[PDB]
Subunit: 217 residues, 4 copies
Amino acid sequence: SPLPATHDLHISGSINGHEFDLEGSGKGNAKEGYQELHLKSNKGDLSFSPWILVPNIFYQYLPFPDGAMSPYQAAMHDGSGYVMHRSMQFEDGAMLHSDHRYIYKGNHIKGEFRLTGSGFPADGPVMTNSLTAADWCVDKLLYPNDNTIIGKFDWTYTTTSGKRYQSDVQTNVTFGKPIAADILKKQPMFVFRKVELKHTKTELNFKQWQKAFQDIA
Amino acid sequence: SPLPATHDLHISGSINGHEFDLEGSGKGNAKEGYQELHLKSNKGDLSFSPWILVPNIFYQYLPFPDGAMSPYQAAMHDGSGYVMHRSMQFEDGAMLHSDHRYIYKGNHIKGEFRLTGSGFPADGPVMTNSLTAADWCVDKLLYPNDNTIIGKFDWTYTTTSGKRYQSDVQTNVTFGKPIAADILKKQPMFVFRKVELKHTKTELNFKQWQKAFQDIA
Amino acid sequence: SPLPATHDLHISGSINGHEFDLEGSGKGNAKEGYQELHLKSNKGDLSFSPWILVPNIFYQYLPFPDGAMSPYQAAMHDGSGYVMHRSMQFEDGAMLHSDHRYIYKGNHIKGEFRLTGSGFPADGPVMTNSLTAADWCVDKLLYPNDNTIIGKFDWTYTTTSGKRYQSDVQTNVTFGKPIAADILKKQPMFVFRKVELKHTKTELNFKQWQKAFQDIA
Amino acid sequence: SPLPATHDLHISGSINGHEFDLEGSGKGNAKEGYQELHLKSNKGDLSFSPWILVPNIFYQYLPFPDGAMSPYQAAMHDGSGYVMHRSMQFEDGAMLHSDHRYIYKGNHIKGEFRLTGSGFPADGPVMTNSLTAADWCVDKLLYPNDNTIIGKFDWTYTTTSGKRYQSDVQTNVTFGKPIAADILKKQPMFVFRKVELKHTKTELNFKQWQKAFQDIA
């Protein structure tokens, strides 16, 4: 494959025991690190805040510095691929995990993601649709061996009450073939990201900007 | 349904990106809190320690004190049911999550569990088959609302090197109908458990003893 | 050197930047694991709930099963002693850590404990004095080497709003001489404890029951 | 009151039960965020890696973007000041917490820091003096109220074995007077830092570069 230009997602699972299922498609610019995505519900109104689906709703769009391939782009490029496993542990006892898989067809990505979240209090901000935005975020990446990335960040939403809603997030990424040795020797790597989300109870329109860096200006 | 006497399990998922699939059946005594289970692999040799599948491999077998129904037994009994979501966060960066579902037919339980684990180091004890036993364990249960249990324990295996292998475990359990009010008012509830496991690379024979308590002798 | 019968405590430090200092004395029965303590403020009214000082306000009072000395007792008996280091991570972002040391004079203990707590929200239960009790509690102990105990528990208070207030607690105990070999081979050890506190803005009256167990029944 | 030019530090406490005490002085440039420090032992050879004292061994040296004073600087400028409380939770079970306070005399700072670390395994890198460097680091800052900063980062050293040594770090900073409203509305704030340490068993020579950023580029 070449770098991606378009993508689809089917995302499904359960929040607090209630099933959900969404699909749609979007596109992005792999040299800039931008992507956008539209999603629509196949099982009626979401009963939880759609913001809880971020960051879950495609690092193939992420270049590394000076136009290098990120390990994600390189795994798409030679077709050997990767999967992701993410965990989000919320300050109020809720947890959400996801599993991520992809199929490539030329410059188009197809994502199949599965999520389980539970323990969201009925009066907390996820179940009351009170999340208003996600903070700008720096992700820290380490490669503990030649085919694995362990990434971590502190994830916070703003909410209608003025209190932030916080979680610890860890993303383990497992590659089909080893990561090139010139990528392995630049650790740690950071990525700055921004997101936007518009939503109804049945539809999401998401956008993301990402930029990798080892050092700041 | 009455209290359970027999059960089946189909458990599947992936460890470090490698898929696995096991099935088999067992039985237990719901007044005593004991169960046993046999499992066999449908996809060849396991490439990871089978001990990592404990505690994942049926609280319907657990009575509450003085022969009362645990909330699990009560949900089986009226057929309204529950699901479980567990998270295990290992000291060496590995994570494993599971989702648990059941179907009842009279006094027989059918379990369908899905797991994802990743980030297990190639020389750590899970990937080198070096786990030797799980420690006796006290689980602490709270009910933050009328249809949810949040349980927690510190989980440790002994290993061939003599060092323990540790993880934090949280289990969120979500019920179809509310939990009876006489159970909700006894918090917290503790459960003492012991397990045994014999295994090969393709087969497991597991046993478990459990006992609920609010206080000790 | 005999088992403890009486004890004094001077405990000081700060909570959210405000200093506090209390002193008093108590007694207990080292055969039964009971102790009680009275404390009085040296710096005016406490500006935080005095419950946040439990569990910090003497395991020399704790026997092991069948009349055996606990490791804490044996270190007092031979004079070699120990220090403790405790950490409390609250669900709302606050933290509290303490440092415990002791001087023995015959069957009397003197404690000097130092504490720093911070990040307690102004409308949370510690700062509005809304904690009403501490839940009964099971401590899990391990000995990763011959002179160290690592213990853990999930600590929850009830509050006036009905919502529990949770923290993760880890206690690291370091001994001046090795623990006896027969204590070391019995792992994990659990300890069941209950406490009571009555308080004013300047005074505390504290009671505690503790009992070690390896198994139940 | 001017921005800092020089500083002294007396830092003491214990690691695994062994006491240590160091003092020395340094300087830096409060316009650029650079500082350096020399420390010498008052109690013989350190029995642990001196790297475990970073990051604990002065944010008064940190400016905010465009020549703005950081909150740390403004609290020194008006004399109202702040304290810090830091916690380090290591992947192998050790913990280290510290308490920081300051006295200002013109453009000179005096620090008195107190630390307790424990539970470092005898064959781990802190006790065998195998830490070789600290990874470059991004600190995320939030202000949950007008006089408190909660900061977080994942802290990793490299070691002689090639395996990284990780910890979760949280720093809570409490101010004597409210932070300015224009600092408060810019959240999250990130800080990029690099450090160097050369050491012997009795002496440390430490350098640090820091730079605040809200976004990159």
